[model samples]
Target: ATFEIVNRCSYTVWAAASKGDAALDAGGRQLNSGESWTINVEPGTNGGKIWARTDCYFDDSGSGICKTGDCGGLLRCKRFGRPPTTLAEFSLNQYGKDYIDISNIKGFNVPMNFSPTTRGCRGVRCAADIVGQCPAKLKAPGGGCNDACTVFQTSEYCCTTGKCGPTEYSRFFKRLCPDAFSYVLDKPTTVTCPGSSNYRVTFCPT
Candidate 1:
């Protein structure tokens, strides 16, 4: 799998990608506005997530903290990002094909566009300014909106019972970016792609 991550936001972004335990793109890098990086997924990797970290301050040793989407305060994220972060997920070599999706299950931070660089497959995007428009209760510390599950942490919102549907809270997100996953059990947004298809993940897109 190959992914070209681009940052178009006015601020900085830490681009990160991981496939299970293996880190890609040197585990990630600091991208200034208008910068981009191409990641070549290592062999034997099936799939994982690509995300951004904002408002971060890492030391020269590559250790510090980020207000949003921080991964153990490590520049080289060894795990998934924190909540209130937008996610670009991809699955490779699955059933002789590939699958991609933009997930808001973690919530939304930066605007994003995830698309195939090659192939007729369509692209998916969620560029809503959720941070500025977020409801008071669901707003996060950093510039993002938290999913209901993160704020309320109940069975109904978190779907701990494995049985739930869209609530008014989820609708806030679903309505803003209908293309993303509003809840954990939310359905039907995967994009099927032909094998060896390269992709692009644009942050803070229009």
Candidate 2:
């Protein structure tokens, strides 16, 4: 994939299509970092364009780079999934998980980049690295950093490519725990869960 310059900045900076030197593009230009710029790209091509905020390191600090305080790891050139214009549609699988797939959404191919406000972890002991949020035993493409974790542990176990925004997490909880729920990280301040003679119910943020 490749990127096109939607807007230009007047500062000394550098941008590359990929992480390696071979993919390096213009270097040290005049633009303010964190400025929004659109990149036009064709998927499946060798390179693609994407919009991103730049970083102090003179690289795309938005969603396309690996590590480096960005969330869209390794797929910086991809686009973001369009936010649901209408209420999300969900379906249940045989495994009893409710899910909404936005792969068909426009710009859905892009990944999430971490930021101070847009961070993935919560709590005082929040993980230092995004990779540490999930157990290494899980597989990629499906595992790692699910929204189910409230504490250092995970609440849900399924895997998918989409990142878990609070809305996404609430949808899953609604599907998974529709009755007598307490609280959802995304929507509805409260939910109810069925009461059992064997135990009491409590709500956790994961």
Candidate 3:
């Protein structure tokens, strides 16, 4: 599997990805406007996730922090990141197809489009103005939206036993992005593409 991470935002963003113990693209890299980075991954990989961090400053050792999607305050993230951050999750080359989704379950930071470049698969684009439209309690500190579960940490919002249904906040995200994973139990958000299909994740895409 492959990923071409693109930065189309007016400002800069740091891209991050995790697959098993490997941090794709060295976990993080500064992606200025119009910049892109390609990642090579082994086939049949699962538990894969990608996201971007905003408002960050890192040192030569890749030591620093980001306001959104901060993973242990390190640029080369070894673990999953914090929320109020958008996520692109997929299991590549699985059983003749790549299972994928653009998840708002963690919330939203930058707008994104996760699409296949070589296949006719339906792209998952979440480019809504979530920050500007976020409710007061769901708003994050540096212009991002927070998921209800992250903010409140309750069974109702978190769907602890996977029994919860769409709450008010989850509905908001679902309304904004129809294909988004609005909550734990949100169904049919996943898309499928043929094996070996290359993907592009564009940030701040309109």
Candidate 4:
């Protein structure tokens, strides 16, 4: 199966996909409005995450920074995007099924929709205008909303220990996107699909 990244937003987005020791497609590549890119994936590939960077500027040597979702200021990201970025996470062909979700546990920058192009597979997304309505304390620099874990960093919000549940801050995000992960223990956010299904990740999907 493959991941089809579609940019439906008005501005340019630098898309990134990180899979453990390997990076998919052309890491930190730009996807203009209405453009799309695809990355083929092998079965049983796990711990893959896809995200978008915005308001970025780079030089000829691919050295610069993004206002949001910057990954070590490198054009080819070797790690996860920084906080305040929407994330589409996946574990493909694990136990014969694919696990996927759009996660805002680290925070939300752009609206994202993750869906299977094939029929019978469930689609899950977090396409909310979170930046505009972000709480005063959780507002990130430049743009996007910071999650409780990013803002407070306490065990109650971070869930670093045993049996943590949602807090008032997490509930705020859950109200906006019930299907998307709002906190570390947001278990109900995930969806499963057949391993044969190809997925589409749309930024600012209409």
Candidate 5:
């Protein structure tokens, strides 16, 4: 299967994807406004995640960290992105279904919409301007919003132990983007689609 990654923001965005141990096709690339990139995945591919980096400054060798979504300071992200980034996660062809979601569990930096470009699949989005209205404690240094876990680092907020529910801070995110994964234990975040369907992930969608 393939995923189409689009950038609809007015500024340039550096998109990064982690495809487990396999090498990603153009995994790290600068996408201008309205540009798009595509990546292919194998059947039953699990634990794949994608996100966009903003306010990045890399030389010709692609060796700079992003203000938001820095992946170990490498353009080609070998690991998961840092927090305060809107994540598009997937586990494809598992249990006869494709699990997908736009997670603000680690917080949100940009608006995102994830949907099956093909038919027969439900779409999910988190297009809220969380940065502008983020709580004082959850606000990031440059831009974006941070989850309670990142801000406070307590077991209650991070859900480090048994089952946990939303807190007042998590509720703030949930209120704006009801369908997004607001916290570690946030339910109603994952959406399923037929395993055979392809997906389109749009950043800063209008």
Candidate 6:
């Protein structure tokens, strides 16, 4: 048997089983800007229930907030003798401050954590990158993009690098209106670095 869950929102959705259906496994995973999953049902008549969550970790100022009528999708259970279940499409405030719960799923029961491997402004084009020199090439004066006269020109890397400088005006703008994809997540997820793991588990279902 198999089960699938879809995400209608713009952000990523994560699912996990706190109890029943499957073991109370303490695990985590992350999804990209928009993604979904389906997997083989755990072996048993009493398929367990899982908790589904998605993080809208963008600045709530403008484009970050996904509100009423902004979401759509359906969940399906094969061999359950019923039509594919449609999930109540809803949006959460920016930063996942609030949550919506969907229960009684008989699939993997454990969804991946909301950990994103690649990130924005962490290494390059980040505040530290501008202040410090992670990518020394960007630090060059005339040859590099950093031109003190121009606003974004100082950091040629665009939103990520010199723009993130502490004194830069755009940095404060990001705080007020952080919808730009260049805004780095406050806290990132913990996962094996991509190349570190021998066998990468690319796909996850809930």
User: Can you give the TM-score per candidate against the true fold?
Assistant: 0.95, 0.22, 0.96, 0.95, 0.95, 0.24
Q: Model 3, stretches more than 4 Å misplaced?
A: none
Tens-digit lDDT track for model 4 on 1-206? 78899999999999988874777666668899999989877777788889999999989988899988888887777678888988899998887788898888889999999999987678988887888888899998778898988888898888889679988888889999998888888767788888767999999996
- Model 2: CA > 4 A from native: 1-3, 8-16, 19-30, 33-49, 55-206
Pairs in clash, predicted candidate 5 = none
Instruction: Judging by TM-score against the true structure, name the best candidate.
Output: 3
Query: Of the pair 4 and 6, which is ahead by lDDT?
Result: 4
Q: Quick one: ranking by lDDT, best first?
A: 3, 4, 5, 1, 6, 2
Local error of candidate 2 at 88, Å?
22
> Model 2 reaches what TM-score against the true structure?
0.22
1-206 per-residue lDDT for model 2 (tens digits)? 12222222233122223222222233112234333332222222222112222332324643233212222343232222111100111122214322221111111111222111112221111112322332333212322223333222433312233343444443433343332111222333221111110111000112
- Model 6, range 31-71, lDDT digits (tens) per residue? 45445454333222132333343332333322221111111
Lowest summed-lDDT stretch of 10 residues in model 1?
39-48
Question: Across residues 79-186, which tens digit of lDDT does each residue of candidate 3 receive?
Answer: 788898899888987778888899999999999999988866888999998888998999987659999999999998999987899999999999988878999898
Candidate 1 lDDT score at position 178: 90
Candidate 5 lDDT by residue in tens digits, 17-38 = 8864643565677889999999
lDDT of residue 171 for candidate 1: 85
Q: How many times do residue backbones clash in model 4?
A: 0
Which of the two candidates, 5 or 6, achieves a greater TM-score against the reference?
5
Higher-lDDT candidate among 2 and 3? 3
Off by over 4 Å in 1: none
> Relative to the true structure, how large is the alpha-carbon lDDT of every model?
0.85, 0.24, 0.87, 0.86, 0.86, 0.25
lDDT, candidate 1, 1-206, per-residue tens:
67889999999999878764767767778999999998887533566889999989989999999888888888988787787889998887777677888988888888899999998689899999888888999899676888888988899998898999989888888888998888878887888888678899999888
Best-fitting candidate, measured by lDDT? 3
Q: How many backbone clashes does candidate 1 have?
A: 0
Compute the lDDT for candidate 6: 0.25
